[PDB]
Amino acid sequence: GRVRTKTVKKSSRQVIERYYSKMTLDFHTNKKILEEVAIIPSKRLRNKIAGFSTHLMKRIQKGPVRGISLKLQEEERERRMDFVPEESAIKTDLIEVDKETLDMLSALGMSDLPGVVKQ
Amino acid sequence: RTLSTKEADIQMMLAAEVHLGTKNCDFQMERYAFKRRNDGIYIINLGKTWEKLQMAARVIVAIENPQDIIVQSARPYGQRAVLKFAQYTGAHAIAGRHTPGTFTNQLQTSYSEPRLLILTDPRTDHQPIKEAALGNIPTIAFCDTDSPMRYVDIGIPANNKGKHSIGVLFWILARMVLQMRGAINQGPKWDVMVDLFFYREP
Amino acid sequence: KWVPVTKLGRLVKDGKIRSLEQIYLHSLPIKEFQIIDTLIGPSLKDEVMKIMPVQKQTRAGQRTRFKAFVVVGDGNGHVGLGVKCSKEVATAIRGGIILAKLSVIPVRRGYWGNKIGKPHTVPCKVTGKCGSVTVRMVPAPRGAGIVAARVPKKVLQFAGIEDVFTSSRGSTKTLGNFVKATFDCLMKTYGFLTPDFWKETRFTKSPFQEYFDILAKPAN
Amino acid sequence: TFKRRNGGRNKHGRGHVKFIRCSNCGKCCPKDKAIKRFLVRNIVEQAAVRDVQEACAFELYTLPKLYLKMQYCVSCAIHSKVVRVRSRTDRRVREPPQ
Amino acid sequence: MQNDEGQNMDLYIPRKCSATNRLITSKDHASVQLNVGHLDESGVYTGQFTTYALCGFIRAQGDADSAMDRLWQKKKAEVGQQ
Amino acid sequence: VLPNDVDLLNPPAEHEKKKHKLKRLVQSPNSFFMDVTTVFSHSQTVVVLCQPTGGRARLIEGCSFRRK
Amino acid sequence: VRVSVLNDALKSMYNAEKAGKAQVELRPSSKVIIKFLIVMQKHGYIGDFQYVDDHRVGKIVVELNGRLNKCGVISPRFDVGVATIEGWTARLLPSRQFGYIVLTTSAGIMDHEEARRKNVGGKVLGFFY
RNA sequence: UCCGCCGGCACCUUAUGAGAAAUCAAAGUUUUUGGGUUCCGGGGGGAGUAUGGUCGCAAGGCUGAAACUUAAAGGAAUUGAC
Ligand SMILES: [K+]
Ligand SMILES: [K+]
Ligand SMILES: [Mg+2]
Ligand SMILES: [Mg+2]
Ligand SMILES: [Mg+2]
Ligand SMILES: [Mg+2]
Ligand SMILES: [Mg+2]
Ligand SMILES: [Mg+2]
Ligand SMILES: [Zn+2]
């Protein structure tokens, strides 16, 4: 088998977290970046980390991943959620209520509400 | 004619179907249910729901440090409202899965000691409610008709299932807390839009 | 040194809280043994009750672990019980001492007859159960002594009880349950609502609420 | 030690239940205790439906089904794998599987 | 509690549950002490509140919610809160 | 209703209506008399104005009965 | 069958008090139960109780205040002279400072403390504390 | 079809309860010990044996020991090994 161990996977995620800008989609370029930004004792370990990191870069391109936290990417998602339509989805007028609901409001003395109307 | 603060909120809650309960009613939630229709669905008395919101707000304002208040939800529909509720009220929001041992394991990073706990649904948030009973932590929860009341100090009778219902409830609660602090003007209106609390699907 | 990780630890470390009764009043859990060493530290006195080896069957042999029972108390209304299992006798004892401090409870004391001198016996009849062991304590007149077996007697001495009558039912030879049952009835001395407690409660702010500003500021 | 609340059978408010004979070995077993399975399948196996249909002497004809009710004793049901030994927690599940 | 002379002989006076009147022991970690703020004519917190203590027994039974509602419905009518 | 949300001395009139006649705070029969000549609501005798049954006697559609 | 109406009345109150109820209904009612309640009421162990007339035996609704630890009958009703009151208290009461044993004497139903003052013996009905 | 009441065979969740635990909505309301009443147990064997009585056609039933012997037998649950 060729399952990467925690050493390879854990190191690869850390590199991408704080060097996402430097990392590219090319294995040969990535393995040269690891030498510059990390101390990997063995060449074989460095190749495995570079290859798995390149695999993770491809994962990030298509969508978000689980164990990698990219601060710049997170900010983009926040802005989209904050966007809301100018028209509220709750219509105060033309409120459809049932017979029981109307009687419930009568007990409260609020049977004169504008929006409330029987179905 | 002009509508009082209570009437305006009840009108807003009706549009969000906050009064529509589950087909089953817990024996400790009967005191809040008004009537059962032939469909079998219980109707929550919105008059009592508003009163419990005021009582919950009084407890929240009594907390000197808002950071001691933790509000969280497990279901995705409430994950947006809790974040916005903490943004305006200064509370601490925890959206997603609760890590066991947060309130009991003092040596893990996520350890916390809140003074108050706010939850969206006791049935889905059983873990934090169960764990809160080991640290003298009072809890406030929005409870539906079929919601267990165990270890719940203040239960707000409302529909904690629909996306609109969850957002409106937190929007009203956030407004009440700020109004009781004097930060914003009284009345049923707030410069913040309720749609910021509704769930935003991908 | 000590770096508190809980709100009480900082307050005790700072010095805002200076008595265990202020903690017992609000029923706040205690998780750090340094808190106990800071409030009633010098007056405490630990004592190992028994070393109990336990064995787990394994393919190669039987895993022998040592279980230590430790009782702590100042002899003036505070007593604690702690049990820890460890692979080493010394490690078990040290951990048992820590656990005993974390479980310290207030022990209420009363008078058999006339209220003359300091309290010397339990205020009422109290019983505690653990497993099959049930230990009963009945108020006794001054000078009667502690009429109890060795295990309850040691706990009562550390709790400050001077005279009491005791009876037991069940397997008292199970020391773990015998000592725990004795500790169980001691904590119930404050749970019985006597007429003198009928006075309406006067609530006071909890330490967390009283010192919110100090707790809000991070400690560095 | 009592293994099941029902005692391995289904009898409440009655003294005696007449037994049935196991379809496999003929062992006597109370009807409420026997494992019952109602098997409904085509009288012709799927491997022969095509051949039989091609040789049918009628323009339209529906192949009849074979209805067989099987009543097993405990030993035969376990051996035949009609039922399996379940964990202590899973024994209480009474709903049929998927 | 009090010696024949008058001196107190108790370490502390445990709280009593506001609903069941039960004493709250030092290890009753399920018990919670709650504060309800007081408002003014405008409706702004004035720094005053009413305290309620609940034992673990009642909270475990699920009756804390009903107990708190009844207690508040009475207390507010006495201090003018509404 | 929870025990503490109800008053035993002054139960709601609707609640006592559906309770068993013997289990109410004060026992009260569910039967009554009516005109048509008084007829018992649970009459055990054939009057054919009413036909006895296991409960209330089956009245006849034709005649009109007035409760009293 | 119903043997001791007093036992049912006290057992119902004890169960209700532990459950944290505010009210409890006692049925049937008797003048022995009412006098037993009055002794408890005078010592501040129960609140206000109301007798309901149903033309058969009546009923009692008792308001609880949370001060009652336990209340039970002693059956059979043993004879207790004044000299033997001390032994019974050492058996049934938590301590020598609170708790009352209710006795039925020729002078009426009263607690053991009152019996000593009047120096009258009788039979044990129950106890509470 | 919907709501409710009384009675019955049961089931499901739960502990504020109980228990050595399995588990029990009773096996709960028990050292904070007492509603009424019947039967019945006192380490394991010898032994439901001997003997006497009694019932039965018989098979046996009911009643029912001692000498002597023994430091365990047994209940529930845990980890292994099988
Ligand atoms: K079966
Ligand atoms: K039924
Ligand atoms: Mg077996
Ligand atoms: Mg039957
Ligand atoms: Mg049979
Ligand atoms: Mg169960
Ligand atoms: Mg007994
Ligand atoms: Mg024997
Ligand atoms: Zn078979």
From Swiss-Prot, chain A:
Molecular functions (GO terms): structural constituent of ribosome
* Keywords from the named record: Ribonucleoprotein, Ribosomal protein
- Source organism, top-level taxon: Eukaryota
Q: Which GO terms describe its cellular component?
A: ribonucleoprotein complex; ribosome
Gene Ontology process terms (BP): translation
Family (UniProt): Belongs to the eukaryotic ribosomal protein eS17 family.
Q: Please report the name of this protein according to its UniProt entry.
A: Small ribosomal subunit protein eS17
What taxonomic ancestry is recorded? Eukaryota, Viridiplantae, Streptophyta, Embryophyta, Tracheophyta
Part of the intact protein present: 2 to 120 of 144
